Amino acid sequence: MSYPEKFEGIAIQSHEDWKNPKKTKYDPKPFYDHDIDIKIEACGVCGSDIHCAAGHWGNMKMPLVVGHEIVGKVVKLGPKSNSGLKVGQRVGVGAQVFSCLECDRCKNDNEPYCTKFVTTYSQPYEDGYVSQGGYANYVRVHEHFVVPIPENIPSHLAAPLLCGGLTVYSPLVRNGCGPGKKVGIVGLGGIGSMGTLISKAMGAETYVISRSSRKREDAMKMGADHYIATLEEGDWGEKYFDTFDLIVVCASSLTDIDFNIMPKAMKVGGRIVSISIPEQHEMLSLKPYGLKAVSISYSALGSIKELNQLLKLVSEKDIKIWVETLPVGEAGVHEAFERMEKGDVRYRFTLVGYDKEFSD
């Protein structure tokens, strides 16, 4: 039925047919004093969306509404709200929808790494409800995770930042991506793109590192000071020896990426940071010997503090990311999905046209 009691959205019915989501009606999460209800109007299709649906993460309780690069308007503030959000205000939600907010890690701004962390969708809250939202009309989120969206940034062009962009940003900021640093982006995909842009925006000689050359042109349109085609190198680590300060590996899987060569290209003290989460059956594997004065680590999402920093940056220096809009709906999602697997996206798919798909 109408808003209040029931939410509607394009939802997965079975991992078996994850490519065919059907519009569905479901009960929202119980509303809490700090929660906020946001009427959605745009949602970036995140690679994670695809892996989840396909069940690459495991068997998830269905039905299931995916999507977590949300940009909608505030349509109802809970009793104890104090974040300073007004009703009808333009807001965003990313991958995190809950945290404890009391631990050291939260107070210290590392909510993605909280003991009691909960993700936007597919995860049951401490009370049982399995997080939904995304490819739907409304999403119910705790105010700490809802953010203001700068005026100049358009919805379809902001949403992707709530997750993908943030994901690249966090490690880039945290590891000094800035003036005079040499940064490599491994995998000019959805997240790969924003990182390439975000990276430059920060003033770092950005190198884009892909396999073929299919994307050389784009990487360069994006402002990448350099591009590297692995298949055309034999030993790129050898050629680019001692050049990088930081390399953020953001690629769907971690198979076609030899991790015994990469270190060579890192400066003493260099850092390789992966943004990936592949089909569980996968593991990041590399020869130990090589981590000689070069560290390797993994990163998850970012802290809302940073999510804000990014939005601001994307806003202040007019960062135009590459998005191709699709119409929300059993179809749009389908295409969206279909294509994302084929890798047939000009980097980011932002679902829109929410207004004319759910009605009243």
Report the binding-site residues for Zn(2+): 46, 68, 100, 103, 106, 114, 163
Partner from its own copies, Zn ion, none binding residue 106, C-beta < 5-8 Å depending on class: Zn ion
Q: Give the nearest distance from C-beta 268 to its own copies in angstroms.
A: 4
Give the residue with the Cβ less far from its own copies, 26 or 113: 113
Asked if 302 and 321 count as a contact pair (C-beta separation under 8 A), the reply is no
What gap in Å lies between CA 108 and CA 112, rounded to an integer? 11
Partner from its own copies, Zn ion, none binding residue 46, C-beta < 5-8 Å depending on class: Zn ion
User: Binding-site residues, please?
Assistant: 46-47, 51, 68, 100, 103, 106, 114, 163, 188, 190-191, 210-211, 215, 250, 252, 255-256, 275, 277, 298-299, 301, 348
Instruction: Collapse the DSSP code of 156 into the 3-class scheme (helix H, G, I; strand E, B; otherwise coil) and give the result.
Output: helix
Task: Pick the binder of its own copies from 105, 211, 264, 348 (CB under 8 A).
Answer: 105
Task: Pick the binder of its own copies from 110, 193, 206, 230 (CB under 8 A).
Answer: 110
Looking from the CA of 167 toward its CB, the CA atoms found within 13 Å total 30
Residues 285-304 binding its own copies (CB under 8 A) are 285, 287-289, 291-300
Asked if 165 and 149 count as a contact pair (C-beta separation under 8 A), the reply is no
Q: Give the nearest distance from C-beta 275 to its own copies in angstroms.
A: 12
Partner from its own copies, Zn ion, none binding residue 163, C-beta < 5-8 Å depending on class: Zn ion
CA distances from 32 to 74, 179, 270, 278 (A): 15, 44, 44, 34
Partner from Zn ion, its own copies, none binding residue 271, C-beta < 5-8 Å depending on class: its own copies
Task: Pick the binder of Zn ion from 43, 114, 139, 157 (CB under 5 A).
Answer: 114
Q: Give the nearest distance from C-beta 149 to its own copies in angstroms.
A: 27
Residues 170-209 binding its own copies (CB under 8 A) are 174
The one-letter amino acid code at 24 reads T
Rule CB under 5 A: is residue 93 a binding residue for Zn ion? no
Residues 223-262 binding Zn ion (CB under 5 A) are none
Closest CA to 194 of 227, 167, 215: 167
Q: Give the nearest distance from C-beta 293 to its own copies in angstroms.
A: 5
Answer positive or negative: Cα dihedral of 323, 350, 40, 56. negative
Closest CA to 52 of 277, 229, 223, 202: 277
Give the residue with the Cβ less far from its own copies, 71 or 272: 272
Task: Pick the binder of Zn ion from 103, 229, 284, 300 (CB under 5 A).
Answer: 103
What gap in Å lies between CA 165 and CA 94, rounded to an integer? 10
Kindly write out the interface string for residues 111-140 of this chain, putting x where it contacts its own copies by CB under 8 A and - elsewhere. Answer: --x---------------------------
Give the residue with the Cβ less far from its own copies, 294 or 313: 294
Structure tokens belonging to residue 64: 């299931």
Structure tokens belonging to residue 225: 């000071």
DSSP label at residue 102: S
Q: What angle do CA 165, 169, 175 make, to 5 degrees?
A: 160
Residues 238-277 binding its own copies (CB under 8 A) are 242, 268-269, 271, 273
What gap in Å lies between CA 191 and CA 300, rounded to an integer? 13
Q: How far apart are the first and last CA of the chain?
A: 8
Angle, helix 190-201 to helix 164-174, in steps of 10 degrees: 40
Q: Give the nearest distance from C-beta 292 to its own copies in angstroms.
A: 5
What gap in Å lies between CA 86 and CA 323, rounded to an integer? 28
The residue length of the chain stands at 360
Residue ranges that bind its own copies, judged by CB under 8 A:
104-105, 108, 110, 113, 174, 242, 268-269, 271, 273, 283-285, 287-289, 291-300
